[PDB]
Design a protein around this nucleic acid. Structure first.
Ligand SMILES: [Mg+2]
Ligand SMILES: [Mg+2]
Ligand SMILES: [Mg+2]
Ligand SMILES: [Mg+2]
Ligand SMILES: [Mg+2]
Ligand SMILES: [Mg+2]
Ligand SMILES: [Mg+2]
Ligand SMILES: [Mg+2]
Ligand SMILES: [Mg+2]
Ligand SMILES: [Mg+2]
Ligand SMILES: [Mg+2]
Ligand SMILES: [Mg+2]
Ligand SMILES: [Mg+2]
Ligand SMILES: [Mg+2]
Ligand SMILES: [Mg+2]
Ligand SMILES: [Mg+2]
Ligand SMILES: [Zn+2]
Lengths: 178, 137, 11, 135, 37, 133, 125
RNA sequence: UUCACAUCGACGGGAAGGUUUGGCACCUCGAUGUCGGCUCUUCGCCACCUGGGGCUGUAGUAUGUUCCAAGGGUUGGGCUG
RNA sequence: GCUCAGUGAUAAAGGAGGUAGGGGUGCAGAGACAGCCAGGAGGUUUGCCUAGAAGCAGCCACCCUUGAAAGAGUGCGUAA
C-alpha cells in the first residue's frame, strides 16, 4: 500500500483508447494495440478525471511487489502505444557495418559469414551506414530484447572498446601490452 | 540536521538584522562558482548585510517585522540583502550589473521591498537611479 | 569426519 | 608458547568441563574484551596465534592482556601403538575455559579498530565468542 | 567469478543480491563478482 | 591552459619552460619578458604561474602567490624546512613578517581582511615547522 | 487430495458393507487429466523415476515433461500408490479409468459424480 | 612494481570422505583366504582430453584458476612380486 | 501463531537487504532517507624524499583561513 510507485496515478493522454474487461486490459493507441492480464491481487482503477490509480486486493508482501511492477508495466504500454520506444546501439571497429534489407538486418561483425536477423512485425529498425542502429517499437520488452540480441553477437571487449555497444555505455578499458 | 534552538536563534538573528535595515533585496542562485560568491562578499559586507536562508526561516522572521508583503519572493531558492548602514541605491545597483554578467551564470532578480512596499523585478530600476547621501542632503 | 553414528539401541 | 615450568607427575586426568566460570567474568584491566561463549580446551598455540593476530592488526593501538594460560598437561600415544603398557607422552598444554570466561583484554584504540581486531582474534579460536565493553 | 562459503562486499560499490536462492555479489569491476557456495 | 613554476627575473631556459608551454602554441619571448616585467613590478620571488592560452594563440597569465613556504623560509633566515613539522622547529618570525608576507601575497589570496591573511601564513608556518610570535 | 478420495471409493471404504477381502468398491472415471493442479514448485520438481533393471538404467522425468507426453500416467501412478498392494490391489486398480480429454466413452454406464467432502481439495487462483 | 583476496597464502581454526598407515575384535574358522597380469564388466566424481562458460597480472597464440558437465575417450613398448 | 526451503531425513565454523516478531538508539514539519540541480575553496605544489611526489609511491605533521559546506584528502587517473 505504501510503495512510492503505486501511489502515482497514470495519465492516459487523448489518442489513447482504453478497453477494460475484468482483469484483462486492451489498449489501442496511435501506434497499435497492446494486451496484458493482471494477477489476482492487483486492481487498477480507471478514473473519471482520466487517470489510472493502482490499488491492491489484499496486502501480502507478494501483492506489494506486484502493484509496483504493474503500475510501471502498464505506464510503459500506454506511453508505448502513444509515442513508442527507441533503443540505439552503435558499432565500433574496422570493417564493422550493418545493412537493413527487406525483412533482415545484416551484420558484418568480422565473422566469416554475414549474420542475418529476422525482424519482428512490431519493430521498425532504422540504420545509419555511419555505423549506428536504432530500433523503434511500441513495446519496451520486445525492443529491449532485440537490441540485446544484436549486442550479443560481439559484446564490447575491454581493450580497444571494439564491438556492438549501446549509445551510452561505460566500458572498462584495460591497457593491453602496457 | 539543525536543532530547533539553532533555527530559532537564526530566525532571531535574521529579525535583528531586519529591524535595523530600511530595504530588502531578494536574489536566487543556482549553478554558480564560490569565487564570485567571495567577490560579491568582498563588495557586500562593507556597506550591507547578505543572508542566505530557507523559505520558512524567512517567513517567520519577516511576518513579525511587517515585511510580510514580500512573501511571494520566497518561492524557489532564497538569498537576501538587508541594508544596515549604507543607502538603498548603492546596494541595489551592483546586483543588477552582476545579473548582466550572470546572464549565462544563472542569476534572476525576484523583487525588493522599500517604504514597506513591494517592488517587482523591473520596478527596482528606480531604486538603482537614486543618488548618494551627498547629493540628496 | 570426526563424528560417529547411532547404532542399535543408541539409535 | 605459554607452559608451566615444573610439575611432579607428568600425566593427568582429562577432567570434565562443566558450568560457568564466575571468577574470570569481569573485565578488570583494559577497555574492550573477548569473552568465551562455550565450554572448551584452548591449546597454547591457539592463544599464541590469537594474540599475534590481534597485536599485528592493532599495531599503533596500545595494549593486549592475555587473561588465560595453559597449565594442565595433555598426553598422547604414538601411531600404531597397541593399547596397554602405560599412559602416553605429554605433547602440549591446554587451558580449560568455560562460558563467561574472559580471554583477551584490549586498550588504546577506538571501538571500531577494536571490533575488527577482536574479530581477527576470534578467528583462530576453536570456540564461539563475544565482543564486550568495560563497565 | 570466485565461489566461496563466505561472501562479503570487498569495497564500497559492492552489492549483495539474492538470485534464485543463492547469495551473490555484483559490482562495477569484474574481480569483485562472487557467488555463495 | 597550463600551470608552470618559474624563477623571479629569469626566463626562457630550454629544459624547464619553453618546450612545455611552447607545444600548446604559446609565444616564448612575450610570455617570458611580460612575466619578468610583472615580477620586476612586484617584489621578485619564485612564482608558480598559470598561463591561459586561446584558439588564436594569444595568452593571458595570472601570477599566483609567491610560495608562503619560500617567503617564510627567507623570513626566518633558513633554507630547508623542518622534516617533521610541529616536532622540530627550524626558526622564528615576528608578527610584522606575518603582516609583510600577508601584504605581498594579499593581491593573490581570497582573504577579505589582513588578519585572515596573517592566520593563513601562521598556518603555513605552523605546517612547515617554523614557530611564530 | 483427489487421489485419496478416489482410493476410498475404489476400495469400498465408504459402504457399510465394506470388506477388506473383497471388492465392494466402485469404478471411477477421471477426466481432464492434463488440467490437474499441483502446489508449489512441484510442476518443475517432483520427479517420476523408473528403472530398467540394468545398471545405469535409471530414467527421470519432471512432472511436466510427463504431463506433456502422456499425462494420464500421472494420475494412474498417484492412485496406484494408495491402493492396497497385492492381488486385490492390482485387480482393484483396473477399476480406475483415466482420460486426457474432457470426454469419456462410458455414457452407457450412467456415471454419477463423485462426492468430495474435503475442504482444501479445490484450488483457486 | 602500486594492490591481502589474478596467482600463492604463514600462524591458527571448522568440516566431509572412507581410497593410505592404523585402533577395535562385532564377523567367519571345516573347504568364508592376500598383490600383478589376461578376459570381461559396471558405477562414483575430487575433470586428464573432448562440449559450454566467469576471472586474469587475458593484446594475439598459448596459459593460470575456477564454474556446469561422467555422453565418449584414456596408446604401444624397456624395466619390477 | 509460523515455514515456501518439499525444509519437514542427518553435521560445524562462517556467510546473508530470506522471513515473522521483540527490544534499545538516531534524526526529522524551519522536510529525514533515496534520486536529481549546484558547490566541493585559500594557504598549497605542506614539510621530507625523489629525475618528478602537485590530496592520491613512501615518511612525518594533519593546523589555519574564507565559509552554507569542503579531509593537507575516500577511490580512479598523470612521467609529474
Ligand atoms: Mg564416519
Ligand atoms: Mg544449571
Ligand atoms: Mg573456582
Ligand atoms: Mg571458530
Ligand atoms: Mg577469504
Ligand atoms: Mg567373537
Ligand atoms: Mg564351501
Ligand atoms: Mg564437478
Ligand atoms: Mg573445457
Ligand atoms: Mg576457462
Ligand atoms: Mg599475453
Ligand atoms: Mg565425461
Ligand atoms: Mg558413463
Ligand atoms: Mg570413463
Ligand atoms: Mg603405459
Ligand atoms: Mg528431505
Ligand atoms: Zn567492489
Amino acid at each position: 500500500k505504501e510503495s512510492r510507485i503505486g501511489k502515482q496515478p497514470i495519465t492516459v493522454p487523448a489518442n489513447v483508447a482504453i478497453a477494460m474487461e475484468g482483469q484483462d486490459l486492451k489498449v489501442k493507441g496511435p501506434l497499435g494495440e497492446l494486451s496484458i492480464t493482471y494477477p489476482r491481487e492487483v486492481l487498477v482503477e480507471k478514473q473519471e478525471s482520466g487517470f489510472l490509480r493502482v490499488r491492491k486486493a489484499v496486502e501480502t508482501r507478494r501483492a506489494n511487489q506486484m502493484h509496483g511492477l504493474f503500475r510501471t508495466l502498464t505506464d510503459n504500454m500506454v506511453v508505448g502505444v502513444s509515442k513508442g520506444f527507441e533503443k540505439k546501439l552503435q558499432l565500433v571497429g574496422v570493417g564493422y557495418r550493418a545493412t537493413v534489407e527487406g525483412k533482415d538486418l545484416i551484420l558484418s561483425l568480422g565473422f566469416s559469414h554475414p549474420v542475418r536477423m529476422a525482424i519482428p512485425d512490431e519493430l521498425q529498425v532504422k540504420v545509419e551506414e555511419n555505423t549506428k542502429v536504432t530500433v523503434s517499437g511500441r513495446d519496451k520488452s520486445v525492443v529491449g530484447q532485440f537490441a540485446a540480441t544484436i549486442r550479443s553477437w560481439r559484446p564490447p571487449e575491454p581493450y580497444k572498446g571494439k564491438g556492438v555497444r549501446y549509445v551510452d555505455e561505460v566500458v572498462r578499458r584495460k591497457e593491453g601490452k602496457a | 540536521a539543525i536543532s530547533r534552538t539553532k533555527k530559532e536563534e537564526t530566525v532571531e538573528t535574521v529579525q535583528k538584522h531586519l529591524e535595523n535595515c530600511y530595504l530588502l533585496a531578494a536574489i536566487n542562485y543556482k549553478g554558480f562558482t564560490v569565487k564570485q560568491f567571495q567577490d560579491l562578499r568582498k563588495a557586500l559586507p562593507e556597506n550591507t548585510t547578505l543572508i542566505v536562508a530557507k523559505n520558512t526561516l524567512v517567513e517567520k522572521a519577516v511576518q513579525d517585522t511587517q515585511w510580510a508583503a514580500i512573501k511571494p519572493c520566497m518561492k524557489g531558492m532564497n538569498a537576501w540583502l538587508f541594508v544596515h548602514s549604507e543607502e538603498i541605491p548603492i546596494a541595489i545597483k551592483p546586483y543588477r550589473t552582476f545579473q548582466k554578467e550572470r546572464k549565462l551564470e544563472d542569476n534572476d532578480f525576484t523583487g525588493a521591498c522599500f517604504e514597506g512596499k513591494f517592488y517587482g523585478p523591473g520596478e527596482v530600476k528606480r531604486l538603482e537611479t537614486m543618488p548618494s547621501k551627498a547629493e540628496i542632503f | 569426519s570426526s563424528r560417529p553414528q547411532k547404532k542399535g539401541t543408541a539409535h | 608458547m605459554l607452559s608451566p615450568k615444573r610439575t611432579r607427575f607428568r600425566k593427568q586426568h582429562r577432567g570434565r568441563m562443566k558450568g560457568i566460570s564466575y571468577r574470570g567474568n569481569r573485565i578488570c584491566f583494559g577497555r574492550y574484551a573477548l569473552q568465551a561463549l562455550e565450554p572448551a580446551w584452548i591449546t597454547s598455540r591457539q592463544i599464541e596465534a590469537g594474540r599475534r593476530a590481534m597485536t599485528r592488526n592493532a599495531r599503533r593501538g596500545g595494549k593486549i592482556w592475555v587473561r588465560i594460560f595453559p597449565d594442565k598437561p595433555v598426553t598422547v600415544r604414538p601411531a600404531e601403538t597397541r593399547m596397554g603398557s602405560g599412559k602416553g607422552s605429554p605433547e602440549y598444554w591446554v587451558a580449560v575455559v568455560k562460558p563467561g570466561r574472559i580471554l583477551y583484554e584490549i586498550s588504546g584504540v577506538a571501538e571500531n579498530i577494536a571490533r575488527r581486531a577482536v574479530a581477527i582474534a576470534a578467528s583462530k579460536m576453536p570456540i564461539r565468542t563475544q565482543f564486550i565493553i568495560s563497565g | 567469478m570466485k565461489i566461496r562459503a563466505s561472501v562479503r562486499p570487498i569495497c564500497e560499490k559492492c552489492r549483495l543480491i539474492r538470485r534464485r536462492g543463492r547469495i551473490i555479489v555484483i559490482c562495477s569491476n569484474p574481480k569483485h563478482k562472487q557467488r555463495q557456495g | 591552459v597550463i600551470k608552470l613554476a618559474l624563477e623571479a627575473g629569469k626566463a626562457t631556459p630550454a629544459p624547464p619552460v619553453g618546450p612545455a608551454l611552447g607545444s600548446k602554441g604559446v609565444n616564448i619571448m612575450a610570455f617570458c619578458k611580460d612575466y619578468n616585467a610583472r615580477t620586476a613590478d612586484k617584489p621578485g620571488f619564485v612564482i608558480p604561474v598559470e598561463i591561459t592560452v586561446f584558439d588564436d594563440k594569444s595568452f593571458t597569465f595570472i601570477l599566483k602567490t609567491p610560495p608562503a613556504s619560500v617567503l617564510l623560509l627567507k623570513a626566518s633566515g633558513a633554507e630547508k624546512g623542518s622534516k617533521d613539522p610541529q616536532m622540530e622547529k627550524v626558526g622564528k618570525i615576528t608578527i610584522d613578517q606575518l603582516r609583510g608576507i600577508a601584504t605581498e601575497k594579499l593581491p593573490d589570496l581570497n582573504c577579505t581582511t589582513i588578519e585572515s591573511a596573517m592566520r593563513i601564513i601562521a598556518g603555513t608556518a605552523a605546517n612547515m615547522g617554523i614557530d611564530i610570535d | 487430495r483427489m487421489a485419496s478420495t478416489i482410493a476410498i471409493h475404489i476400495r469400498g471404504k465408504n459402504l457399510a458393507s465394506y470388506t477388506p477381502s473383497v471388492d465392494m468398491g466402485a469404478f471411477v472415471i477421471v477426466v481432464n487429466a492434463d488440467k490437474v493442479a499441483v502446489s508449489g514448485k512441484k510442476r518443475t520438481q517432483k520427479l517420476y523415476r523408473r528403472h530398467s533393471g540394468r545398471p545405469g538404467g535409471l530414467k527421470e522425468e519432471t512432472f511436466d515433461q510427463l504431463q506433456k507426453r502422456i499425462p494420464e500416467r500421472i494420475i494412474e501412478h498417484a492412485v496406484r500408490g494408495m491402493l492396497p498392494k497385492g492381488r486385490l490391489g492390482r485387480y482393484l486398480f483396473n477399476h480406475l479409468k483415466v482420460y486426457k480429454g474432457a470426454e469419456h466413452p462410458h455414457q452407457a454406464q450412467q456415471p454419477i459424480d463423485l462426492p468430495l467432502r474435503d475442504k482444501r481439495i479445490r484450488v483457486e487462483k
